[PDB]
């Protein structure tokens, strides 16, 4: 009776597509055609943080917009003071293969993970000096890809085992698990209100999960290739995506369909990092073409190019106040960009 | 103000300490050569890992990271074992490895196409187009027994055997039949043709027929790695 279940599956999918189309009336490019473009915005490398021994794979700012943590495949977690371009902490890592790093909102914890399949949590404010491994979150039967602290005690980590999870640091076991992605889950972003999070996988689709329940509410789709970078629009009602199909996409939570594709004929390499600005108007995405293109959110127009990286960019984020955007690439260099007046 | 100046001085002192430690770790990182061991389930990768775990004091959810010294040179050979069948995204973490030691069963005569496609993917990957591959055609003795005993014919699986002959630059082992030379070099030339019919001048393949004694295996790895680093230093110095 597997054929009957398949028939029901296609019937439900057709019904969902019909509902989305019935809710699809006007394209966002149509309504925002009248929106005044931000124009050509230029930004420069105010501070180029250097010291990373090997390629940079991930970066995460702090809530105070001052401290950022960058992970390198050398096996280091360097915490930088962007305002004064000094290194505050350097955490040697057990496994050199690091694919993620997270800064806790409270500022007292850092996270890391990679091919070792274990999420490593580090205390920054121990009673004594130096940084030590707090807990080792084990149970992911695959490489960790992205992790983000919900709160000082909880953390939701995404893995290549086609299943995300939310952990308890003290407990150390997966309190809730999130299953449903067919391929490797790579990215993970938290809503401004810590109630929901979305994760995009190698199944060329992105799913939205509810933290306190454990089932994915919606499954946004549309990307031709695997979704390798995700981020949340600041409003909390939208989220943008990055795929190796060279087309960033914006999906809104409510209408539950594609809104625009940020595409260009010249661009053929894949996006690697996506992060909206504070007003949500500027979507900054990095590519394998060794530079970042800032995309207007309301109009599919390239605002500017953040050239300056020799190798492919891997991470990109903005401060909580949006004062600056820092992009790390595989040339072991992390560079902060800030608008020029 | 005075307190802010003291905080700035303390932060600078922390910077100096971290920078000294980072220079030391840069020294140890430049010294160390990172090798990646790849292969299929039927390939002798597991045997090599088990051997090297105890021979070189292997440190050991599935990353077999071992660091050893051979002739005062630092090596870091690792195998991704805990990951699932998908290999298109955790392989990007290995774009900077010194070499990719590829282990092929070479006696399955059935799964050789999977190994060929794996070598194609490794060679033509955009992020591994710089990395040389040390081709390790393992289980050469088993292939010799299979060819000598007859029974299965390689012509059934690979059809180009009927129009292939030993190259003039052939190095058979002293006492050993022509047919097994033909089969062995057919496999080697299949891999080499797959390698050469691609971008050259950046990465090269190092075919090797694994023998019973593993010291020759380690010697071939060492020589290939030295060659790779020599060529890379030629590239950075511009003399290429």
């Amino acid at each position, epitope marked *: 009776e597997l054929d009957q279940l*398949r028939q029901e599956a296609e019937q439900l999918k057709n019904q969902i597509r019909d509902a989305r189309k019935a809710c699809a009336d006007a394209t966002l490019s149509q309504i925002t055609n009248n929106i005044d473009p931000v124009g050509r915005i230029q930004m420069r490398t105010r501070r180029t943080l250097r010291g990373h021994l090997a390629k940079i794979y991930a970066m995460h700012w702090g809530t105070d917009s001052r401290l950022l943590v960058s992970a390198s495949q050398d096996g280091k977690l360097i915490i930088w003071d962007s305002y004064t371009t000094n290194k505050v902490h350097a955490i040697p890592l057990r496994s050199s293969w690091v694919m993620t790093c997270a800064y806790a909102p409270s500022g007292n914890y850092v996270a890391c993970g990679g091919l070792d399949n274990i999420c490593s949590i580090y205390n920054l404010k121990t009673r004594e000096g130096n940084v030590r491994v707090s807990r080792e979150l084990a149970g992911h039967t695959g490489y960790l890809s992205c992790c983000r602290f919900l709160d000082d005690n909880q953390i939701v980590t995404s893995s290549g085992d086609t299943t995300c999870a939310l952990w308890d640091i003290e407990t150390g076991q997966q309190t809730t698990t999130f299953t449903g992605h067919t391929g490797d889950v790579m990215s993970l972003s938290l809503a401004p209100d810590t109630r929901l999070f979305v994760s995009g996988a190698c199944d060329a689709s992105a799913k939205l999960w509810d933290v306190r329940e454990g089932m994915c509410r919606q499954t946004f*789709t549309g990307h031709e290739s695997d979704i390798n970078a995700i981020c949340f629009f600041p409003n909390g009602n939208a989220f943008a995506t990055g795929s*190796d199909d060279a087309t960033c996409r914006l999906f809104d939570l409510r209408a539950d369909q594609e809104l625009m594709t940020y595409s260009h004929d010249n661009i*053929i390499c894949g996006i690697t990092s996506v992060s909206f600005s504070k007003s949500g108007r500027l979507l900054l995405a990095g590519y394998d073409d060794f530079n970042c293109n800032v995309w207007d959110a309301l109009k599919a127009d390239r605002a500017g190019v953040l050239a300056g990286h020799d190798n492919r960019v891997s991470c990109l984020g903005v401060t909580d106040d949006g004062m600056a955007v820092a992009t790390g690439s595989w040339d072991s260099f992390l560079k902060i960009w800030n608008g020029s007046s | 103000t005075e307190d802010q100046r003291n905080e700035e001085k303390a932060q600078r002192e922390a910077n100096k300490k971290i920078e000294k430690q980072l220079q030391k770790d840069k020294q140890v990182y430049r010294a160390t050569h990172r090798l990646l061991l790849l292969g299929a389930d039927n390939s002798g990768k597991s045997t090599i890992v088990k051997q090297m775990r105890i021979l070189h004091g292997g440190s050991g959810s599935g990353i077999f990271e071992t660091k050893f010294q051979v002739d005062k040179v630092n090596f870091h050979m690792f195998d991704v074992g805990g990951q699932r*069948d998908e*290999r*298109r995204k955790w392989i990007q973490c290995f774009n900077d490895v010194t070499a990719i030691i590829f282990v092929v069963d070479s006696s399955d005569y059935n799964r050789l196409q999977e190994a060929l496609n794996d070598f194609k993917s490794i060679w033509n*990957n955009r992020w591994l187009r710089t990395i040389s591959v040390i081709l390790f055609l393992n289980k050469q003795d088993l292939l010799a027994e299979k060819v000598l005993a007859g029974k299965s014919k390689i012509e059934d699986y690979f059809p180009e055997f009927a129009r292939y002959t030993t190259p003039e630059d052939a190095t058979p082992e002293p006492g050993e039949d022509p047919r097994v030379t033909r089969a062995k070099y057919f496999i080697r030339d299949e891999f080499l043709r797959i390698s050469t019919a691609s971008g050259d001048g950046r990465h090269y393949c190092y075919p090797h027929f694994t023998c019973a004694v593993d010291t020759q295996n380690v010697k071939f790895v060492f020589d290939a790695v030295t060659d790779i680093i020599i060529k890379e230093n030629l590239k950075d110095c511009g003399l290429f």
Partner: nanobody
Amino acid sequence: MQVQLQESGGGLVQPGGSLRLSCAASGFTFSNYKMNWVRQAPGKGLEWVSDISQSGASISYTGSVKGRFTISRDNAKNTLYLQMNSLKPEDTAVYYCARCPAPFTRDCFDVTSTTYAYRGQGTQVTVSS
């Protein structure tokens, strides 16, 4: 839309016969992808059979099918054709048409893996006598 690849043409045929395979595709620009053909003999894994480039310039076949099957790529209809000729019982399997993971690139890495999104349910080509 959701990436889909629906195979067709699977059916019973006596040894030495012929068969046609069609892979209707949607949701992605068919032109810039190295489409492949993979198959599963009973009690075996996924074996790569044939592949084709963006425009058909470079085609390759598994040695077992070197002189038996042809691959055609009609970019207009977004359909991949695997012509099945001179069938023998060793070819019985469910045939899945699979797309290379990334556009404008020739590194088809995860095509024969146990789970792979850019593929199809497939059709069973039975060569029973």
